[PDB]
């Protein structure tokens, strides 16, 4: 993770600017676990770099007790003669999502592990991803289009916090701080947004007229 002194020296010799690979950031809030996992696994196999945030806000259909019992049944699976090297039951919601995607991948080949290492999963939205660009959703895996609203559903964080996850409150406090900061930064820059909107409005009159008619033809002015 921390770059080598060789890598930094080579970057200095080459003098190239900061490079960031093409990475899609998915806000997994109110997403169906299995459907988002299937879509993300297919996109990873297609060579895309995916970072998923707010994995504690994933949804599973059914009451929270039923899904807690499903997880505890999963936790029962251990190698009896040596629980070390037995199944490793990760309790964090991001680790749960990573496991689901890994199960939807050919994890025992170089191609599958290449796909799996292309996925980064977080709980909440950490600072290194807040300002990297607009986040996406998966329309075909969203809760308001997938579940009939009458039926109960589980929030992944609530289940994980009761099956052994320790950082529920830490993630909650971090998200509270992040949303407060982002709301402050968005109440600011309002003058900038209004200024740009009025600039476009005035440009609509300051520009040549046939261009305005062309914009009216294509529903832009």
């Amino acid at each position: 993770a921390f770059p080598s002194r060789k890598d930094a020296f080579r970057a200095q010799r080459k003098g190239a600017k900061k490079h960031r690979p093409e990475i899609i950031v998915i806000d997994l809030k109110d997403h169906v676990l299995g459907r988002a996992a299937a879509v993300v696994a297919k996109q990873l196999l297609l060579g895309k770099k995916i970072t998923v945030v707010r994995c504690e806000q994933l949804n599973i259909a059914g009451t929270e007790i039923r899904n807690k019992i499903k997880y505890l049944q999963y936790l029962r699976k251990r190698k009896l003669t040596n629980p070390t090297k037995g199944p490793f039951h990760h309790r964090a919601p991001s680790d749960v999502f990573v496991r689901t995607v890994r199960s939807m991948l050919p994890r025992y080949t170089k191609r599958g592990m290449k796909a799996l290492n292309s996925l980064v999963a977080y709980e909440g939205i950490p600072p290194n991803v807040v300002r990297t660009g607009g986040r996406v959703v998966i329309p075909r895996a969203q809760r308001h289009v997938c579940y009939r609203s009458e039926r109960p559903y589980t929030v992944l964080g609530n289940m994980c916090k009761h099956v052994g996850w320790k950082y529920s409150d830490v993630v909650a406090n971090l998200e509270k701080a992040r949303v407060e900061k982002a709301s402050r930064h968005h109440e600011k820059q309002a003058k900038l947004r209004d200024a740009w909107k009025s600039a476009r409005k005035e440009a609509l009159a300051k520009m040549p007229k046939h261009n305005v008619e062309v914009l009216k033809k294509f529903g832009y002015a």
């Binding site: 196999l45 297609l46 060579g47 191609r111 290449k114 796909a115």
Partner: protein, 96 residues
């Protein structure tokens, strides 16, 4: 699998009609080797000398209903090290 045919997913091609529109177009897979080998215009354009290589193919037919295409490369099949990597689908030969 049968490696003599390859499957290519193109951005914004999500219907069988689009993949039909692409039937016959030239297809390129660009990669690099370890040494600088012979290329087109090796003598005419010495600026093209590079470790970069390319394998060429054509779109033969659409695959499925969702814009996937079947591609056959000239002679040899495309390497499996290209699975998940970029494929160039050019707009020629042009029928329009």
């Amino acid at each position: 699998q049968t490696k003599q045919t390859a499957l290519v997913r193109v951005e914004n091609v999500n219907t069988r009609e689009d993949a039909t529109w692409y039937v016959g177009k030239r297809v390129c897979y660009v990669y690099h080797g370890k040494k600088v080998k012979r290329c087109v215009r090796w003598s005419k354009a010495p600026a093209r000398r590079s470790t970069t290589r390319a394998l060429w193919g054509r779109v033969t037919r659409p695959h499925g209903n969702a814009g996937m295409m079947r591609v056959k490369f000239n002679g040899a099949s495309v390497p499996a090290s290209a699975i998940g990597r970029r494929i160039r689908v050019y707009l020629y030969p042009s029928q329009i």
